[model samples]
Target: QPRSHVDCPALHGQCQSLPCTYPLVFVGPDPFHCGPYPQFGCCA
Candidate 1:
């Protein structure tokens, strides 16, 4: 099965800057999902 969480490096999805064009999937309130970024959400 596919994973629900997508990383920034994996899909070049930025957790910071701006919201992703896709649906926002927040992994946590930390940078663990997308590395060092103010935002903590992942792009689907």
Candidate 2:
């Protein structure tokens, strides 16, 4: 099956801060956590 999303860093995406690009999605907490207080992950 095709994957809808993958790890942020896996796709060379930054996990720091919020307001990711339009084509990108947000994933987060614990495992996929990032920096800037309310840590979050990214998927492009």
Candidate 3:
């Protein structure tokens, strides 16, 4: 599932604040997660 929103400050304050993008882990039945994805990309 793709995220409906994107917050740079939220991520910078909560998660890593380095270059590149971030990850969106799917712990549901799908069981999947991205790796340092581009901040402008989408999830599945």
Q: Per-candidate TM vs. native?
A: 0.28, 0.33, 0.18
Q: Write the per-residue lDDT of candidate 2 for residues 1-44, one digit (tens) a residue.
A: 11234454445555644566667666544244344433454434
Candidate 3 C-alpha lDDT tens digits along 1-44? 23224433324322222332445422222112223543332222
lDDT of all the models against the reference? Answer: 0.48, 0.48, 0.30
Candidate 1 lDDT over 1-44, as tens digits, reads: 13434344455555654444546544433355554654555543
- Screening candidate 1 with a backbone cut-off below 3 angstroms (N, C-alpha, C), the clashing residue pairs are none
Worst 10 residues of 3 by lDDT: 25-34
Q: Report the C-alpha displacement of residue 17, candidate 2, in angstroms.
A: 3.0
Comparing 1 with 3 on TM-score, the higher-scoring candidate is 1
Top-TM-score candidate index: 2
Error of 1 at 43 (Å): 2.1
Q: All candidates: CA RMSD in angstroms? A: 5.0, 4.7, 10.4
Please list the residue runs of candidate 3 whose C-alpha ends up more than 4 Å from where it truly belongs after superposition: 1-4, 13-44
Cα deviation of 28, candidate 1, in Å: 7.4
